[PDB]
């Protein structure tokens with residue numbers, strides 16, 4: 185509900201080093217290919233970081249309805265960019281319950 | 284044996300490190316690619332080198 | 333073993349077939365039927381049907 189947005193500009197963006205930072209499976213992009221992110225280049229890059237559950241990862245996509253996509257975080261229909269999601273059991277889970 | 288980030292690189296028309304310098308598939312490739320996890324056989328607490 | 337789910341080792345087997353141009357050497361377990369000529373039949377010659 186209070187997702188952070190970070191503006192990235194005026195720098196050289198190497199996207200191959202992202203695979204070392206987090207243990208994610210797929211670099212799921214929508215308007216661009218994940219392997220062509222080093223040749224072409226953009227004007228501004230925004231990073232939106234938040235935490236959801238596994239039933240709701242499919243809702244972070246252009247043109248979905250539900251709980252996150254309708255009330256918390258909505259993506260535009262003409263959205264270009266990549267969505268990266270990975271499990272966080274070992275750091276963002278407690279036996280008493282996260283609140 | 285590769286890691287989980289490069290399983291998507293074993294496909295026709297892909298680049299990176301495995302598909303560019305180690306194992307490259309042709310663009311007109313026919314066949315099947317079978318991959319499964321091997322944490323019980325290729326992992327050690329001291330590190331597999 | 334303490335790494336994430338994306339840093340786990342993976343064993344890959346790539347079965348690279350090639351389509352039939354030469355005589356076929358490897359084929360699946362299909363029972364061959366005796367040949368009949370001069371009749372309208374369905375034929376299965378080395379995988380190609382008609």
Ligand SMILES: *[C@@H]1O[C@H](CO)[C@@H](O)[C@H](O)[C@H]1NC(C)=O
Pocket residue numbers: 204205206
């Ligand atoms: C994340 O940052 C901390 C503190 O700088 C560092 O100890 C840790 O190794 C970093 N993790 C990765 C995966 O780079």
